[PDB]
Amino acid sequence: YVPPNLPPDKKWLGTPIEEMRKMPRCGVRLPLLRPSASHTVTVRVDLLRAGEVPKPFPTHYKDLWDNKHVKMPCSEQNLYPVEDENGERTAGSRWELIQTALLNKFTRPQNLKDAILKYNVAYSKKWDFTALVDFWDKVLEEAEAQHLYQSILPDMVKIALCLPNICTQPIPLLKQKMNHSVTMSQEQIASLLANAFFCTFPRRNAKMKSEYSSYPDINFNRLFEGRSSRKPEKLKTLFCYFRRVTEKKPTGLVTFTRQSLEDFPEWERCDKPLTRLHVTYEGTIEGNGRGMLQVDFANRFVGGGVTGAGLVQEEIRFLINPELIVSRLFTEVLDHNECLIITGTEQYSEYTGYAETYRWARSHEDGSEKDDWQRCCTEIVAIDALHFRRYLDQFVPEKVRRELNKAYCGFLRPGVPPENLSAVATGNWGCGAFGGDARLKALIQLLAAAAAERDVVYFTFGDSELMRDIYSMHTFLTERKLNVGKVYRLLLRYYREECRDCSSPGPDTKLYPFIYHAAES
């Protein structure tokens, strides 16, 4: 069996993208937004109005300093050692110290370093600021620098110092195994992120031991270090966002949901049929996948190295939709059965290149519509693929199954009828440094989608051969009426027949050809 010839000029194959479901059109009427045991809501839902800045709930700051909530910089329990008249330790208020540190004229990058180190004195000989100096004094020309230190920086200080008036409700940690959502305003996120820039979140810096070993970095200190040339583009991207939100308060909401399933399908017996596919070697997940469930190829620590060195797919997404960064404040490292679903973030920047060639291009005007909770209609899911030391490891049935389950967790929305579900916009999940096979991972995601009753739009980013191969295989299987179980069975056969007893870097026969021979013969 050779697959037939397909049109050579054609940029996309399969179901016309016009026919895939997308939000807001496909969505279920949203119920009244309200708090519950499973949903923390940090705003006044009764006052929500398109184009008006949401009001915080409750009205006045309420603090929790414990192991279940974010430890806020503005807590009365955020303390530091002060010397009294005999040189003995008294406890002073770190928030008061932060305020007086940050309320100073920065005319010089050393002024900003000096401020940040006042309430971080333990890191005065650990945190390097070379990349900040470089950005400020060498990358930016004099006019940009001037605007940075007399307008943007002072306005970032202001929203950062208003944290207690803006984020008045404690934020719960989204811990491993929790099925829980937090919805908060874009304005709240701006204040949180301004605090992250100034490295204000307490207890999130220790290496040698911390309560937060299990969480991603949130403070931005590592953005300022090193002799990297990418770092200035990261800063430009983040300052594009900071300029925009300080010049004009954003008005939307954003929902962060951690989802765990304890019981997954017995894939061998799964009778669900394959769903629709649109596959193209042109277009972007964020651009052409507007209104669809957009996959973020995530590190189990969500955002990866975005607050430090790291600029591949996840990091780039967290920089252009920077409100995603705030997930790092409260999202515990993801276990195999978990994902994080973020709804409402907005794209503030456009960019070109990737990793070492990445550059900020320009400001982006997100033209999304907003749902009935005034979230931008942009849903992103962080699902982390496995890292394979050796190519063949990924065909082991337990690894195939782990990837199926992870993707299925990302895609499933329990309760919601499949007709109110948007298509998934994805691509080569885990196929760069993580060693994954594009053709296997394409098929795993197709099976995951099918079991979750969703269509798929798959972007191959310039690989037309991969486009055609993926299209050919989906059509072969659908034409022959092979449900998810039959396909998973063939993946197992490939392993047993071609991988299990193979002493070689690769096997003698590739997966897709094996499937064609096996299924038809």
Swiss-Prot record:
Active-site residues from the entry: D296, E314, E315
Enzyme class name: hydrolase
Subcellular location: Nucleus
Binding-site residues, substrate: I285, E286, N299, Q313, Y354, N428, W429, G430, C431, G432, A433
GO biological process: ATP generation from poly-ADP-D-ribose; carbohydrate metabolic process; detection of bacterium; DNA damage response; nucleotide-sugar metabolic process; positive regulation of DNA repair; regulation of DNA repair
Keywords linked to the UniProt accession: Acetylation, DNA damage, Hydrolase, Nucleus, Phosphoprotein
Annotated GO MF terms: chromatin binding; poly(ADP-ribose) glycohydrolase activity
GO CC term, one of those recorded: cytoplasm
Major localization listed first in the record, in broad terms: nucleus
EC assignment: 3.2.1.143
Catalysed reactions, as listed in the record: [(1''->2')-ADP-alpha-D-ribose](n) + H2O = [(1''->2')-ADP-alpha-D-ribose](n-1) + ADP-D-ribose
This protein's domain notes: The PIP-box mediates interaction with PCNA and localization to replication foci.
Function: Poly(ADP-ribose) glycohydrolase that degrades poly(ADP-ribose) by hydrolyzing the ribose-ribose bonds present in poly(ADP-ribose). PARG acts both as an endo- and exoglycosidase, releasing poly(ADP-ribose) of different length as well as ADP-ribose monomers. It is however unable to cleave the ester bond between the terminal ADP-ribose and ADP-ribosylated residues, leaving proteins that are mono-ADP-ribosylated. Poly(ADP-ribose) is synthesized after DNA damage is only present transiently and is rapidly degraded by PARG.
Complex and partners: Interacts with PCNA. Interacts with NUDT5.
Protein name: Poly(ADP-ribose) glycohydrolase
Protein species of origin: Rattus norvegicus (Rat)
Gene transcribed to yield this protein: Parg
Residues represented out of the complete protein: 438 to 958 of 972
